[PDB]
Design a protein around this ligand. Structure first.
Ligand SMILES: CC/C=C\c1cc2c(cc1O)CC[C@@H]1[C@@H]2CC[C@]2(C)[C@@H](O)CC[C@@H]12
Ligand SMILES: CC/C=C\c1cc2c(cc1O)CC[C@@H]1[C@@H]2CC[C@]2(C)[C@@H](O)CC[C@@H]12
Lengths: 9, 239, 238, 10
């Protein structure tokens, strides 16, 4: 999940 | 606890004004004719880049970072197109008859006819922009509505987060505070609060239509969508 | 001109409560278990019957008969499934976990899996119903919300009678808050509660958009025959 | 000639 990753970056 | 619940109205506005994402440019090349595919490509290219700024902005929305990551995902997955759409309408307010996707991408409805099924959504977006213009929507009210959309659109599909409702209630307080300060009478205040909130229902409508249209472009291979966009589309289910 | 702009808050409520449609019955036969086509036939048979009562209700919504016939048509085409759903949700408020389609058709979350694609919609309806119950939605507020959906849902997809519609929408806002002042709410709680009620209409609109798509899938796959009114009602959304 | 149309006239 890209979103999940972008949200913790 | 939450540093959102003890913010004052003026600190709420200020926080949300500074969180605003920048205006991005289209990679529009005005030396080739628009096709259905080329315009959809311009549109989804820009959307994908705005998405990244939206994710950054959401985390600056008071109360949003309190939530779990899984809840944050659900919320953005639910509201993203609505948030793109309310920003566009706000950008387009003082361009009657036009939609300012980017400063180098200002489109009228006849240019929307390039993509099939598009012009209908363009018309709804333009009528919303017109509505914002006759109401004389202010920047401060806009940042509050945009945040309400983020917190609210996915909240009922949490299958009770009263923390979400706490924050949504504080934004309500904030909007009324801005109306009081603007000199609106008590009844004008609640009247206007309703008018603004009722428009969020039309934005939901536009978002659902646009999601069905985007799915349709994907299923007909008119345009390659980024994996992020593909994922955002997937969170919704269509046919 | 009109007379709807000069009703009092108490007479607005009174008019709206008096305009309420009756609660209709299913012709469900509780001896024959369900199929995807039987339950669905049952649901759209009731919907069709509810629709004819809704049209006579709208005509009783103060300010409505002032609109052009064309404008009345468009508003009901836009709003019908929303109005059906807000009704269902309200009926089901005190039956946690169940949808009360009719006094004799009370369906469990699990029975929605009888129809394909139906359960995700059932869930949204049930969650809305839960929201209502949590807020303790009152009958007087309900009738306001329903009227607001009628007038609000198609207003922007239209002689500026948008302005007349907006004027009466303003009267129903006043009515809502009058009911809240009357219930002893502080100003701050009135304005918060008003916002809560109105943000749910966003979710009702979401559910109608999804329901229309489902209804359309069942139309195409000819799983159930839909009445002429339903067909035309469904055709307006595409 | 919509049915809705007729029902509203009626
Ligand atoms: C292009 C300006 C940047 C973002 C942006 C994009 C859009 C919008 C707003 C944006 O800021 C609003 C409409 C969106 C459209 C993206 C493509 C959609 C989803 C079509 O398939 C149907 C509706 C289209
Ligand atoms: C049996 C209940 C009577 C009226 C009624 C019916 C409905 C509803 C409410 C009613 O009062 C709301 C849900 C409706 C459903 C009708 C069939 C739909 C549109 C499905 O294709 C998708 C969603 C279903």
């Amino acid at each position: 999940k890209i979103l999940h990753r972008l949200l913790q970056d | 606890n939450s540093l959102a619940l003890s913010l004052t109205a003026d600190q709420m506005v200020s926080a949300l004004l500074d969180a605003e994402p920048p205006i991005l440019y289209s990679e529009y090349d005005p030396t080739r004719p628009f096709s259905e595919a080329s315009m959809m490509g311009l549109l989804t290219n820009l959307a994908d880049r705005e998405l990244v700024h939206m994710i950054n902005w959401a985390k600056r929305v008071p109360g949003f970072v309190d939530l779990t990551l899984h809840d944050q995902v659900h919320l953005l997955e639910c509201a993203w197109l609505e948030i793109l759409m309310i920003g566009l309408v706000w950008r387009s307010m003082e361009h009657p008859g036009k939609l300012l996707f980017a400063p180098n991408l200002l489109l009228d409805r006849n240019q929307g006819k390039c993509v099939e099924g598009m012009v209908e959504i363009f018309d709804m977006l333009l009528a919303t922009s017109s509505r914002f213009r006759m109401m004389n929507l202010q920047g401060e009210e806009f940042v509050c509505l945009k945040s309400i959309i983020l917190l609210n659109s996915g909240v009922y599909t949490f299958l009770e987060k009263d923390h979400i409702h706490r924050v949504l209630d504080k934004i309500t307080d904030t909007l009324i505070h801005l109306m009081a300060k603007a000199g609106l009478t008590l009844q004008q205040q609640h009247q206007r609060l309703a008018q603004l909130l009722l428009i969020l229902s039309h934005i939901r409508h536009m978002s659902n239509k646009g999601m069905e249209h985007l799915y349709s472009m994907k299923c007909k291979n008119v345009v390659p969508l980024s994996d992020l966009l593909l994922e955002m589309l997937d969170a919704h289910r269509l046919h």
